[PDB]
């Protein structure tokens, strides 16, 4: 089990994640609420309409094994953070199934040390974006298609950043509780630009 810093750093990285309920923060995206054509979202809301009328369930919350790749220079780490969810569309008013989906997402992570102005070093979240061109929708009776392409399109556009909101502000709090001498041996040796992740 022991080994060093890279191998440690991401089982650490794991471990924290989802000790701070990383799976419960996916489950409970406000996926739906986030969000003519237009005034068909005025018209049920001033009737005493069973709403929305459309729900989505997510389920099936998924951390995958974490990835991890030191800059040229040394300086720099970028953990890759695969997620997955279950969608679940439903109808409340017919109550039926109309689709199930499976999605799968990256999260990018930039972690740097940086010296101040009085010698001593952070370990610093740099960046931390959804990771471009890495969403991907998989649909698991009716016509049903119509659907899923407004709704692959909504995804599209509004899932990366809402997953990014939620996830990014959970690996900033990992990162800072960190054990202090993995910490300490991590920025030591980016501040000095020396190799320690193979591949």
Do not use: W
Request: proline fraction near 6%; aromatic fraction near 2%; charged fraction near 15%.
């Amino acid at each position: 089990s022991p080994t060093g810093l890279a191998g440690s750093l991401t089982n650490a990285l794991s471990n924290a994640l989802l000790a701070e309920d990383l799976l419960d923060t996916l489950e409970n995206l406000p996926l739906l609420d986030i969000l003519l054509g237009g005034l068909l979202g005025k018209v049920t809301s001033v009737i005493p309409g069973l709403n929305n009328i459309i729900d989505i369930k997510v389920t099936d919350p998924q951390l995958l094994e974490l990835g991890l790749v030191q800059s040229p220079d040394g300086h720099r780490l970028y953990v890759t953070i695969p997620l997955g969810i279950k969608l679940q569309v439903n109808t409340p008013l017919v109550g039926a199934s109309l689709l199930r989906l499976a999605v799968k997402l990256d999260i990018t992570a930039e972690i740097l040390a940086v010296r101040d102005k009085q010698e001593r070093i952070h370990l610093v979240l740099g960046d931390c974006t959804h990771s471009p061109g890495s969403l991907q929708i998989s649909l698991l009776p009716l016509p049903i298609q119509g659907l899923l392409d407004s709704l692959t399109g909504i995804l599209n556009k509004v899932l990366p950043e809402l997953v990014q909101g939620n996830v990014c502000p959970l690996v900033n709090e990992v990162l800072r509780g960190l054990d202090i001498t993995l910490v300490h041996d991590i920025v030591n040796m980016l501040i000095h630009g020396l190799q320690f992740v193979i591949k």
